[PDB]
Amino acid sequence: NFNVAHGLAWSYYIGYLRLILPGLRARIQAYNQRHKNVLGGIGNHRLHILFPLDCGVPDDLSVADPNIRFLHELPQQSADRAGIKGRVYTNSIYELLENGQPAGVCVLEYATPLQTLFAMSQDGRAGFSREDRLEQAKLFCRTLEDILADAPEAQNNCRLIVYQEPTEGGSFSLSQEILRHLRQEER
Amino acid sequence: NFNVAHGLAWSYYIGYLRLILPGLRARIQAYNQRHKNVLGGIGNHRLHILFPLDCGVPDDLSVADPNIRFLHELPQGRVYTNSIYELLENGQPAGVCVLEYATPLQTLFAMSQDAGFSREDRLEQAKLFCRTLEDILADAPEAQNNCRLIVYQEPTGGSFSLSQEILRHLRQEEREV
Ligand SMILES: Nc1nc2c(ncn2[C@@H]2O[C@H]3COP(=O)(O)O[C@@H]4[C@@H](O)[C@H](n5cnc6c(N)ncnc65)O[C@H]4COP(=O)(O)O[C@@H]3[C@H]2O)c(=O)[nH]1
């Protein structure tokens, strides 16, 4: 039984989003304070989560797209978690380039449960192919969104950036996709 | 839909157990080399995962039992650290091991506190989570030999001694070595 998406959504919400999002805005503030009249401030205070519905996450997106560039990590959030003293949650600020110059800066990351789905389709078991990985990833996204619609505070502290990928041409820039979202929160 | 246990089991094995267990021996013996002549070695090389079925998972193990005292961190993108604890019995140290809870049970717990999820629903997801993960471990001798579930049903305050439950499993593991 590989019907796993509902689990992934509730696990992501309770085990990460609802634990890390109430502290995010203060760790962005803290970082702005440490480098205020040097680095320049992060204005957008929401966590940007990439959701590639093919479940293709690279281990270093900075080296993936040359228009996405690691800036700094936020101040760490260390916490005792279920017997693990000092479990560490870290988050990263990235810069986005457009047509040469910089154009965006935000706290950004991939939705980690999509890696789970990815490993599941590669593990050699019988009834879980990319087809199923695809429908699981969309059910995951759907359920997580349903969950956030009933959590206004968490919904106001992050932004979900969902996209498929054309596996052919330059039909898609991920920086372009992120920049459009940042210019929608514009509003 | 609250059939969550299946996603919890696959999540916990694929995104954690599968990724930390292979290099657990090496972190232990690096610790043993660092701390041999002073703090002392860690004999038992396996991760011990507490699995309370009532989903009572405090973040500090000493709060669940004063006889479980933190000894030292097991050190070492995304970072994975663990905690070595020592078990007191009759006021004296009786066992040492890398020990932690199965964090996803906290997901089950918070779901019951809400929506559409009751305490019995929770207990049955906890039991389904347990069976599926144990099904997965039986299929992965690699991972199966380097961890141990410690499954129990008491609210971890009482005349139930969680430290005794752990010391029991620790001795049984020494027996089949
Ligand atoms: N980006 C990011 N995501 C995280 C982090 N911690 C958790 N998550 C996400 O939320 C997890 C569910 O939280 P939980 O701690 O209850 O999970 C359980 C947790 O008990 C265990 N685990 C994973 N990493 C660690 C860890 N570093 N330390 C201790 N336990 C860990 O295995 C986790 C499932 O891993 P996963 O597939 O990455 O699952 C999502 C994972 O997508 C994190 O630090 N960074």
Side-chain angles (χ1 to χ4, degrees):
Chain A
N1 189 349
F2 302 110
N3 207 344
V4 128
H6 297 281
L8 295 184
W10 273 105
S11 166
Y12 194 59
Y13 174 74
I14 298 293
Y16 180 66
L17 292 195
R18 201 184 64 177
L19 294 192
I20 207 179
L21 283 184
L24 189 59
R25 185 169 278 98
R27 297 160 59 208
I28 306 173
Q29 154 167 269
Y31 162 96
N32 285 344
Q33 272 296 339
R34 259 146 196 147
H35 321 81
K36 194 192 255 299
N37 313 277
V38 174
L39 222 39
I42 326 286
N44 194 311
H45 291 184
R46 297 185 184 139
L47 179 63
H48 287 65
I49 311 165
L50 300 170
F51 288 86
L53 306 158
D54 64 9
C55 307
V57 317
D59 322 309
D60 270 271
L61 53 145
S62 175
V63 308
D65 196 319
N67 301 297
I68 312 173
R69 163 177 286 154
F70 181 59
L71 241 191
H72 218 311
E73 52 204 359
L74 288 184
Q76 279 190 345
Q77 180 143 87
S78 212
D80 294 349
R81 303 275 305 122
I84 303 272
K85 296 263 230 143
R87 184 174 167 184
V88 152
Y89 304 81
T90 166
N91 308 90
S92 303
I93 306 158
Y94 285 76
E95 169 186 302
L96 311 145
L97 314 191
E98 205 189 21
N99 297 317
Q101 335 181 343
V105 164
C106 64
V107 188
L108 178 66
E109 68 192 31
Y110 281 94
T112 40
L114 303 166
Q115 307 181 271
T116 305
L117 291 188
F118 188 74
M120 282 176 72
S121 62
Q122 316 275 317
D123 68 5
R125 296 183 188 276
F128 198 75
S129 39
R130 333 197 317 200
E131 186 161 5
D132 307 276
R133 189 187 74 221
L134 215 75
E135 247 304 329
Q136 284 306 293
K138 310 154 50 144
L139 211 180
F140 167 60
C141 294
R142 177 168 181 67
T143 307
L144 182 64
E145 277 159 321
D146 290 341
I147 292 186
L148 291 169
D150 283 308
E153 76 293 325
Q155 196 179 31
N156 189 250
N157 291 327
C158 73
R159 286 290 142 114
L160 278 37
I161 294 176
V162 185
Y163 54 93
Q164 24 190 339
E165 210 142 26
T167 81
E168 322 87 54
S171 305
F172 179 82
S173 153
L174 177 68
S175 38
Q176 277 310 104
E177 200 61 32
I178 299 159
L179 284 157
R180 198 191 72 230
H181 265 92
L182 291 176
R183 304 162 165 152
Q184 266 167 38
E185 330 177 31
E186 191 131 37
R187 171 42 165 150
Chain B
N1 191 339
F2 297 138
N3 294 292
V4 85
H6 285 313
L8 298 189
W10 284 103
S11 188
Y12 187 70
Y13 169 76
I14 285 281
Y16 185 53
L17 289 195
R18 196 196 60 173
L19 301 164
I20 37 70
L21 293 183
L24 188 53
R25 314 130 61 195
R27 285 165 66 214
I28 298 277
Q29 283 294 55
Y31 176 98
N32 282 348
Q33 226 49 61
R34 198 190 185 207
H35 292 293
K36 198 130 264 172
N37 293 44
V38 192
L39 185 48
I42 299 175
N44 192 309
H45 285 336
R46 307 193 234 248
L47 175 67
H48 295 89
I49 305 160
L50 304 170
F51 219 111
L53 278 304
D54 76 344
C55 287
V57 184
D59 296 319
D60 191 306
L61 223 34
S62 97
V63 153
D65 188 334
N67 282 320
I68 313 184
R69 188 175 43 217
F70 184 73
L71 189 48
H72 200 284
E73 146 182 287
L74 187 63
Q76 208 185 62
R78 203 148 137 199
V79 302
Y80 302 88
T81 64
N82 304 90
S83 307
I84 312 133
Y85 287 82
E86 104 180 322
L87 310 159
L88 297 183
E89 172 177 69
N90 291 336
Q92 292 166 27
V96 188
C97 67
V98 200
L99 184 70
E100 71 200 39
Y101 279 118
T103 321
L105 298 172
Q106 283 178 348
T107 305
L108 292 182
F109 185 73
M111 282 172 80
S112 56
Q113 311 306 272
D114 54 22
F117 207 60
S118 61
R119 313 133 288 132
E120 307 79 276
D121 293 337
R122 178 166 77 42
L123 179 52
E124 200 97 311
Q125 291 299 294
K127 287 198 276 203
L128 181 50
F129 177 20
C130 180
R131 301 189 198 117
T132 316
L133 180 63
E134 284 177 322
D135 280 339
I136 296 172
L137 290 180
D139 250 1
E142 38 262 42
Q144 181 36 65
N145 195 31
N146 271 283
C147 78
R148 292 285 174 271
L149 307 183
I150 297 182
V151 292
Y152 53 98
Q153 34 171 325
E154 296 84 353
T156 87
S159 81
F160 169 80
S161 171
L162 176 59
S163 38
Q164 290 292 300
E165 189 83 11
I166 303 158
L167 271 160
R168 217 192 66 58
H169 280 80
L170 280 188
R171 295 175 150 113
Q172 151 199 288
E173 300 169 30
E174 193 193 25
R175 255 171 235 124
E176 263 288 288
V177 168

